[PDB]
Amino acid sequence: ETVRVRFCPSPTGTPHVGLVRTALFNWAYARHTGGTFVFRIEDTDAQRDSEESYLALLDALRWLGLDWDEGPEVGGPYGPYRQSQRAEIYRDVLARLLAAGEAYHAFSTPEEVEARHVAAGRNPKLGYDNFDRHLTDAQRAAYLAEGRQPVVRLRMPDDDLAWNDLVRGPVTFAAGSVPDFALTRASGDPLYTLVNPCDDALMKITHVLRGEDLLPSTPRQLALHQALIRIGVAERIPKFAHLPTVLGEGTKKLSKRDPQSNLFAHRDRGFIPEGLLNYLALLGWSIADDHDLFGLDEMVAAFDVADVNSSPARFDQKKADALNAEHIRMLDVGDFTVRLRDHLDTHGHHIALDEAAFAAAAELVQTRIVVLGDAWELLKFFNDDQYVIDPKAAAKELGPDGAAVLDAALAALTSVTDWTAPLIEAALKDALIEGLALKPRKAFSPIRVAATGTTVSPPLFESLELLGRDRSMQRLRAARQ
């Protein structure tokens, strides 16, 4: 304390699960340390989709329950928290760096760097060669006369470049191995290389937790962070922690397309936040050696990113599903029921039971799905306008002997005074095991198909109860033929 971490997405595309794992990892580490979770928008590079993507990002956080302490709408003391709003800041930090001799204007063309390499006997594949560090005022003025627009480069220290990664351990870049790197484009506009460390510095970030795909930037950032201390615009260097990249089934960067990388796919299918967060938390981390099922509070209590491993994290849609199922079954019945009603409703999949019978049906299926979406197939026989008898079922369960069973079942069921669950059971086993003498599963079968359309459904008798007497009788009577 006081830890300060940062989720700093660029508003491009849908949130993928890897990105969302990083948000959760930061969130949990703040909440665990009693520190602060900063939400910074990296929107100096706008594309067509950028508002759409912005809204998607806040929606994602807002669905999974990961509130932010500083950032959009909510504000905070180190604002602003959109980078598109911070250009004055970036121009003044650049002015200060230049004034202090920490950075310099560089005018080399790629061809000119190439040529110097060639004159040296070196391979031109090497980058920038720091040439422009030694420019005379004459040479710099001559460039500007011709209308060369320079980039600003940071002067790297000439000694070894290392840090103790919170995940990886000590990482090392050999002396002299990282060229003076550009902070601006020729138009003057700042780069990721400036605005990302600039804003970590100014927003007093203490711990940077990010995908290990960015690990090569770290020596550059540390050099800038060190420069920023020198010019008096920060006082501390952040620690870094580089998360294992989330892979798909291949060894490949979880692709931008394969739907198992996209958070909205999961949501749309009917993951609940508790299920998805539990799964995300397991991409690089385990709460203990004896279990992997847990809630967000338990995570917050336990989460420390030094316990994140650097080993391969591969996305496993079987384990995801399994965890969601358990987390669905973990819900109290009322909560599950409201969530299930909403999910069905908002997918154009309203079930035509009133509040009380729907609540009964919800509790029937809670233990019988993996995702909220599974309930439509289970449940939809309860609407007249979705009833369809499956041909297979109607070929098993509807045939000649179907007639025998449909007949006796019809006898059986008519006479029940009360369509309450606890009785219908006894009518049919009487008729169909009792006197037809075939297995209890053919006593009830052809009922099921006649009532629901399918050989698999919710528990028969509650389903008959909830169907109602009149609809049950009607469907059975129509079936037999």
Next chain:
Amino acid sequence: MTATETVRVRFCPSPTGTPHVGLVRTALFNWAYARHTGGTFVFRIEDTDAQRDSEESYLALLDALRWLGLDWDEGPEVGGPYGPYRQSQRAEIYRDVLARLLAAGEAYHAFSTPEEVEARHVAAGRNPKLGYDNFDRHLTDAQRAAYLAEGRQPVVRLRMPDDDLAWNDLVRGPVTFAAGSVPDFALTRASGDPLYTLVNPCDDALMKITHVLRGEDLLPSTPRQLALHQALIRIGVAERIPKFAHLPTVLGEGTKKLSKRDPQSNLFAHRDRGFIPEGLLNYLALLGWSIADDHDLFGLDEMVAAFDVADVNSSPARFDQKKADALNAEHIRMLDVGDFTVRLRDHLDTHGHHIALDEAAFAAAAELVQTRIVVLGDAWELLKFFNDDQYVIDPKAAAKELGPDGAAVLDAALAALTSVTDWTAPLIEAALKDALIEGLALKPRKAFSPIRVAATGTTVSPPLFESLELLGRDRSMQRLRAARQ
């Protein structure tokens, strides 16, 4: 929920060797059906055969059932109204019934050897088919008397009826044997002694069994036993024909009856490893049956409430140790901590594995491991570093963790442990964090591994800081210091 009304079922093993899972499944399945139905579970011992049967087997049978927490309503010890319940005590009953069958002409004395279908003579029909002769049905009293004079010793055979023998198996559905497809079968050997073909239906009839639940390996006996049951009604020994329900033989990896060679088949192999009754019961119930379509974890009381053998399925029931292991683990978690602690202490103790911690310490240690084993036997390798006489440094772990990276870690950990003011897991952990992770800048993984190996001797153990607490300061220091050297 419906039954037969007076359901009476039996478990009727012959004591040979150790109780196998197939047989115990059958016992469980009968017991659960009886209790489901308000019915009576009869335990009949089939000890006619002296070559095979054994007190040692008998004793093992009875210990198996009681370990599982089954009981019986009639049988050994308790007796009952239709005794005696060892077939070995019953010889006069079988002689009487055999006499009655002969007098009524249901059975006959046969002097020929036993038709086997390997070779038969065309039955006389328009569509030529193979049939059995059953020639000795037709011997004259005069021929039989001659044969006896000549010293020939007949068996008694039952005359099979001339009609189709079927039944509606509660598991298998309808099964039919068409007229002629079963030879007249012997009820005795030449010595006069009855065979199981007599004594099993005899005693079923006589003990008023209503439902026969048994392995499907016995299913071909059923038409014979139907015929005898029917004759026993005719001669007044029996009242009704029982129902049959033939349970899926459990399948190895091959398609075969799980081998009595296979360790998986022995109930006591699971017992010895540290299966608990709730665990093994649960799985055995799953060999041909499921309580519901949404869960497979349940206790005996739920099993009783639910079980009707007509719900058993006739599919391959493959024994799967990983599944049995997983359900026992779940049942071990499910226990209250104190109950678990006693069972675990008892198991270690009786296996010559007592753990040398006091009552409070052992109970803390038990709670640590309750969630980290699948059988009680696993506790041993987990826990046994708490015994000074069992402390051993794994060579691979030493060479890995107690070379020179080594020195810094151990030195710092010894300093910091000295500094701990009260010997408790949170203060040990705080001290060790602050010396190793803050101080030495290490990844925690790397920061503890040497500590773990020093304290415990191995690179996986119980949760480290609790393990250090229960070892105590003096012991932790000593092992940690010795590893330093």
